[PDB]
Symmetry: none
Subunit: 187 residues, 9 copies
Amino acid sequence: MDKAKRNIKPFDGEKYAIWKFRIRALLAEQDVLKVVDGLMPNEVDDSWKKAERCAKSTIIEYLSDSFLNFATSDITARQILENLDAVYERKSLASQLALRKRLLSLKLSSEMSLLSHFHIFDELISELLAAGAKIEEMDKISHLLITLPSCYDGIITAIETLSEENLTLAFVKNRLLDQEIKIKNDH
Amino acid sequence: MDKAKRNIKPFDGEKYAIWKFRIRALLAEQDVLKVVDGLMPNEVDDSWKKAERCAKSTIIEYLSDSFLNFATSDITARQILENLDAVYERKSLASQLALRKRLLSLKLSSEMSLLSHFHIFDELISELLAAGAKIEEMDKISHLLITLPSCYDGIITAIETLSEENLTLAFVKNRLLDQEIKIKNDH
Amino acid sequence: MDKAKRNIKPFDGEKYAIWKFRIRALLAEQDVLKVVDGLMPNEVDDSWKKAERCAKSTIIEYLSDSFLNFATSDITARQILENLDAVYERKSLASQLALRKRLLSLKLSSEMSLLSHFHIFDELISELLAAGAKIEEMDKISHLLITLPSCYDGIITAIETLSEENLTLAFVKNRLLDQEIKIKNDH
Amino acid sequence: MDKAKRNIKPFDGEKYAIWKFRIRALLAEQDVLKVVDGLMPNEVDDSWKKAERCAKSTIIEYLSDSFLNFATSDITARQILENLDAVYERKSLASQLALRKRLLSLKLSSEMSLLSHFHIFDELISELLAAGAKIEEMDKISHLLITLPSCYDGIITAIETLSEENLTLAFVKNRLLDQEIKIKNDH
Amino acid sequence: MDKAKRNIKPFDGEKYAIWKFRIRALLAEQDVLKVVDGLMPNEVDDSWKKAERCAKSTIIEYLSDSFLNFATSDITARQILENLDAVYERKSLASQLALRKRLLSLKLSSEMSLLSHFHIFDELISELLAAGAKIEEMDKISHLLITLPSCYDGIITAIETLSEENLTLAFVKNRLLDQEIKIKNDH
Amino acid sequence: MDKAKRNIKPFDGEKYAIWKFRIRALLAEQDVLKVVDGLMPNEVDDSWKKAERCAKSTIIEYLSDSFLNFATSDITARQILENLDAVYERKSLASQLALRKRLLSLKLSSEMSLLSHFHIFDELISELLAAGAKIEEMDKISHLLITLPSCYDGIITAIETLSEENLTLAFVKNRLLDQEIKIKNDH
Amino acid sequence: MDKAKRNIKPFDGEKYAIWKFRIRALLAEQDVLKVVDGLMPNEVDDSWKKAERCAKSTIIEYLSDSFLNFATSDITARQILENLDAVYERKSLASQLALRKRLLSLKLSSEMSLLSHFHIFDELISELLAAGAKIEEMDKISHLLITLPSCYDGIITAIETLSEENLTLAFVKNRLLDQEIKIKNDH
Amino acid sequence: MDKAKRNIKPFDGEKYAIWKFRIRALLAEQDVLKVVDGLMPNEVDDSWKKAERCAKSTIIEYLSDSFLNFATSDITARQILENLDAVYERKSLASQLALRKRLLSLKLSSEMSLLSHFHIFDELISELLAAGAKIEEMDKISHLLITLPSCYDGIITAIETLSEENLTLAFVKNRLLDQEIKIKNDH
Amino acid sequence: MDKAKRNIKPFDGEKYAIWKFRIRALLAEQDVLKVVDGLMPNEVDDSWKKAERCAKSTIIEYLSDSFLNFATSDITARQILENLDAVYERKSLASQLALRKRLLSLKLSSEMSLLSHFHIFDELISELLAAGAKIEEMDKISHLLITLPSCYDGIITAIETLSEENLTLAFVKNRLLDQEIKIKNDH
C-alpha cells in the first residue's frame, strides 16, 4: 500500500507533538497507531510485526535524517517517539506566550507596505498554528483591524454592520485593496 | 405602603410625560394607580379614595407653586392629570406643525457634541409627542439621520444597508455613539 | 431592604456591565431580583406583581429618561434587561475594537503608580470579557505587559517565557509588582 | 413614620393657605389630617395622642422661630392651625384690593412666555379667590383677554364676536396659545 | 298730554342703556310703555294701536336717521328694541374688553373734578355691566380706588387698615370725597 | 300739569340745593311730590306708582345724562334724590369747616355788584347748609355784613344793639339793597 | 421613636430660647417629655430610663461641646435642662438692659428685609422674656411700630387708630407685611 | 438601636474626654454603656456580644485608624477605650504643671468674646482634672478670678469679699458674664 | 436592621489593612463575620447564605468600580476580599524589605507631634505585620528607639532599663509623651 504523501513535512522542527498527533491519525486507518499505543502483546502476531515495520517506515518518511539518527536501524517506533518526546518536550509554558510576546513585537503597523502587512498577519497565523492557540479570527481580525489606518474606523465598526455574520475576511482583505484603489484614484 | 426619596425633581412643566409615567409606575408600585387606570370603580370607598388621595399627595410632592395651585382639594386626581395635560401635554395641531418646522430647520454641523445632539433630538421628539404627534421608529431614525453631516452620513449609508427592524432609537443612539467614536479617535 | 443613596445613578448605558451588576446586587437586596430572574408564575400574584412594579420603579429611579421612555408602560423589568442587553450586549466585535483602542491608549511609563494601571486594565478587560471576549487570563495580562518600559526588560524578557500555568493572574501580577517596587526603590 | 424632608418649604407667614394645604396633604400622608379635619375626641386615644403630638412637631419642623411661639406647647396642633388660620386667613379688602390692582396692573406683553402667562393668570385667579372673594367665570375670561398684547389684536377682534359657548375658556386659552405659536413662527 | 320736547338724544349707538331707559320712562308717561314692556295681550285695541304707533313714531323721532332701517314702518316698537338689544345688549365682548381697556388705561388726571371723574367712572362701569360682564362691589371699589393718584395716600393706607363692610362704593366715595376735600384743601 | 319748561336746568351737580328745591316745588305743584314727601306707604296704588314714575321722569328731564347713573332704572325718585343729596349736600364736619374758611375769607369789592356779592354769599350759604350747617339768621346776616366796605357801615350800625326784629334775611336783603341804592347814588 | 433629621442646629450659646423650645417640642413628640418632666422617683423604670437617655442624647447631638461639661457625668435629661437654662437664661437683668438698649438703638434700615427686622425684634423680645422681663403684647407692638422707617411710620400712623384689642402681634406683623407690599406699589 | 447621624467624629485624640463622653452618652442610649462601664456577667449573653460588637463598630466609625489598631478585634471595645483613655488621660504631674502654667499665661488678653474664654477655662479645668489634679471649688474660683481682664479684675475686687457659699463657680461664671454685659452696658 | 452610612471608603486599596479591619468589624456587627473568617459554613443555610450575601453587598457599598467587578457574585465575598488582600497586602519578602528600608530611613521630626509620630510608626508597623513580618512588642519599642531624636536620649536609656515586665508600648508611649510635653515646655 502506497503512503499518500502529505505536505505535512517530515518532522525536524516545531511541535513534534502536534505533528505526531496528526501522524497518529495517519497511523489509525492502518491501525499501526493501535500497535504503538497497544501493550506489547504476549502474542505479537505477524500483523503486529508488519504494523511495527510500517510504523517505523512511516516515521522515517515523516522524520528528517538528523531525527532518523534517533530512529537508527531497528529501535521500535514507540521507543523513538519516547526519546524524541523526552529530549524535545517543553510541555506548556512557551506556547501561548511565545505568540503573545511575538504579537507584542509584531503589531501596530498601519501604513508601511500593506502587502507586507498581509504577510504580517500571515506570520501571525503561522504563529497561531505554531504556538498560540486560545482564540480565532474574531480576535485576530480585531487586532489586525486596530493595526491599520482610518478607513475602517469610519466604516467597520458601525457602518460595515454585522459583516462578521458572513465573517468575510476575504472581503476585509479586499477592503485593503479598496484602500489602495482609492489611493491611486485620488491622484 | 412606603415611599422613598426621588430622582424626580418637583415638576415644573417640562419632561411632563416622562415624569408623569414615572409617577404612574410609582403609583402602580403602591397599587394605587388602578384608581386612575380604571373607570368609575364599583368599589368607590375610603380605600380606593385613599389610593387616589395618596396619588394626589404623591403628585403634590412633585407639584411646584403653579402646579400646587392646580392642586385644589376638590379636583380629582385624574382631573388634575387632565389639567396638567391641557397645560403641558395639550395636543395642539399648531404645536405639532411648529415643532415639525423647527426640526426641519434644526441641524448639526459640528457645534453640538454627539450627546448634545442626542438630547436635542430627544427633546424635539418628546415635544412633538407632547404636541400630540404620532411617531414611529423610522421617523425618529430618518429625522435624526437628516440632522447630521457627511462623516455621520456614513451611518446613513449603514441604515440603507441595514435591516430597519433591528434598528431602534436606543440602538440608533448606540450606533451614533459608535459613529462619533470614529470622529474622536479618527481625528 | 434599604433606599439610602448609592453610587448607582440614573443610568446612561455607560459602564452598563458593572452598573447593571451593582443594580442586580441592589435588586437582590431589594429581594425583587429573585422574581426578575425567577420563574414568572402562570398566575402573577400580587406578591409577584408588587415585586415587578418595585423592580421597575427602582430601575426608573436608577435609569435616565432615555431608557425609561424606551421602556413601554407594560413591559416587565425583564424586557428592560433584554433591551439594555440588546443595546450593550449584542457583543458586536465593535465593542472589542473600542476596548482594545482604550487599552492601547495608556502606555504605563515609569511615572504613573502601577496600581492605577492595574485597576485601569482590570476594569477594561473585565468589560471586554463582559462583551463576550473569549480571552485567556494571561492573554489579558499580556496586553498590560505591552505597556511597560525597558526597566522591566530584565524580568519581562524572561517572564514572557514563564507563562499561564507556570504564572497566572496573581503570580504574574505579583511578579510585576515585585519588579516595579524594585524599580521605584532602585530609582 | 420617618419624615425625610417633603415638598414643604418652611413657614414664616407667607402664602399660609396653600402652605398649610401642603401641610394638610402631609398630615393625610401622616394620616393625622383626620385629627384636625375629623372630630378630635377629647378621649384622644393613645394612637391619637401620639398622632396629635406628631402632627404638632411636624408642623413645627416647617415652622419658623416666631411660629414656635405662635404654636404654644399646650394648644392642640388643630388649635395651632386654627390660630394661624385666623392670623393669616384674615381675608381682607386690604389684600383683595391691593392684589386686584397689582394683578390688573400686570400685563401680558407679547414677550413674556405664555407659559409664564398661564402661571400669572392662575396665580391671580387663586389670589382673588383667597383674599376674601371668589371670581365669576366670564370676568376671569375678560381679565385674561385684557392681559393680552397687541399682536393678538386681529385674533381678539374675531374672538369678541364669539359667544361663551364659542369661547369656552379652556378653548380660548388653547387657541390663544396656538396664536402665540403663530406669532413665534412669524418672529 | 302733548309731544312737548322729550329731549333724549335720538339714538345712534350711543348710551343705548341710558337712551332706552329715558325712552322707557318717556313711554311710561304716555302710558304706552306697556306697548313693549307689557308683552301685549291679544288686545290691539284702538288705544293700543295708537299707543304702539305713536311710540314707534316717537322712537323714530329719538332714533338716528341711520337707525330708521331697524325701525321700518311695519314691526312693533318691541322688535326694534330687540334689534338694538342684539346690536348692543348681545353681551358684546368687544364692548366689555374695550370698556375695561379704557378703564384701566387712564388714571384720574387731576385736571377733572373727582365728581366728574366719578360720573365718568360709574357710567362706563354701568356700560360694562350692560356690556354682558358682571361687576362686583369689590371690583368697582378696586377700580375706583386705584384709578386715583397717590395724594389719596392717606385714605389709600386707611383702606387697608379699615374693614370690608364699611368700605362700600357709597362709603368709599364718601371717604374719597373726604380726601378730595382734603386734597383741594392741601393745595 | 304740563311739563312746560320752568326755571330749572338739566342737572349738572351744581346749585343742587336750588335745582332740587325747584324740582320739589314743581313736583309739589304737580302734587306728585307726595310720593317722596310720604315714605312708601301701604297706599302704593296706581296713582302713587304713576306719580313716582312721573317724578323720576321729570327728574330725568331736569337731570343731565350722567345723573341718569343716579336715576338707575328701578330705584325710586326718592332714592335717586337721596343719592344725589348724599353726593352734593354731603354733610360732614370738614365740609362746613372749609366753607367757613372761604366765608370768613370773603370780602366785597364795589365792581362786584352787591347782588353779585349776594350770589357769592348765597352760594356759600347753599354749600354750607348743604354741607349740613345749622346756619342761623344772625349768621347769614353778620357773615354777609363782614364783606361790605366802609360805606355800608352806616346801615350796618343799624344792627349793633338796634332791633333784629325786622332783620329777617329777606328784610336784611332789603336793608342791604337800601344801602346799596344809597351807595349807587354815592359812587 | 423616629429620630427624624430635625433641622435643629447643634446649639452652642445663641438663641437658646429657640433651640430649647424646638427641642421641647421634639421631647413632646418623642413622648419622653412626660417622663422627663414629670418626676424623678424610683419609678424611673426601664422606659423612663431609656426616655431620659434618648432625650439626653437628643439634647447632646442638638447641642455642642460646651454642654458636655455641664452634662456633669450623669445628670438626667431634666437636670441638664435646668442646668443649661440657668447657664444662659438665669432671669438675667443685665440681659434685659442690653436688649432694651439694642432694641431702642435698633431701627429698620429699609434694605434690611422686613423679615430680617421682624426676627431681630422677635429675638430681642424672646431673649428679654428669658432675661426675665414682664413683656406684654402692647410692648411688642409699640417697639415694633417704633422700629420702622418713614413710609412705614406714615402707615403706622394709620395703624395707631387700631387700639390694642384690635391688634395681636402676628396680626400686626401680617398688616406690616401688607404694608411692605403696599410700599412696593408706593415707590 | 437607632443609626441617626451623631455629631461625633472619627477620633484621633481631639477633645478626648468630650468625644469619649459623647460616645458614652450614645452608648447609654444604645443601653450598651451599662456593660462598657459596668458589670462583667459570667453568663454568655448573646445580647452582650451583639451590644459589644455594635458598640465597637460605632466607636470604629468614631475612631481614627490608630485607635482601630489599638481596637484589637478579639478584645472588648470597652477595654480598648479605657486603655486609650489611660494613655491619653492618665494622671501626669507634668500635664498638671503645664496646665497651671498655661493658665497663668492664659491671663486673658480679652480680644476674644468673654463667654468663649469661659468655655476655654472649662476646657482647662477638664484637662487639669484629667491630668490628675482634680480641683476644688475655691481653687477654681481663685484661678478663674486671676485669669480675667482689667475692668473684670475691678469687679473681682468687689467679688473677693463675696460669701463663699454663694460663690459657687457656676454662680461665679454667671456673675462674671452678668458683669461683662454690665461692662458693655457701661461702655 | 439596615446598614447606616459608614465613612468606610468605596474602596480601591488605599489604607487597605485598616480599611479591611473596619470592614471586618462591620461584618462582626452583622454576625456575618463568622462565615467570612471561618469557612463558608459546611451547610450554608439561608441564614448564612444571606449573611455572606449581605457581606458581599456591603463590600459593594464600600468598593469602587474595578473592585466591584472583582467582586463577581459567584465566589464568596471572603474569597474576593482575600484576593484583593493578596494583591495589595502582598505578603512576600520584598514588601517587608521595602518597608524595613522605609522604617529605618524614617525619623521623628519636630513638627511631627509624638502622637502623629506614633500614628506614623504604628501605621508602618500595621503594614509590616499585615505584610506578615513576625515582629512583636520588643521590636516595636526598639524601632521607636531608632526613630527618636537627640532630645530623647535620656528617656531612651530609661527605656533600656525597662525590661520585659516593663515592656509595653502603651507605658513606653506614655513616658515618651512625658518627654515630649517636657520638651515642649522647656523649648
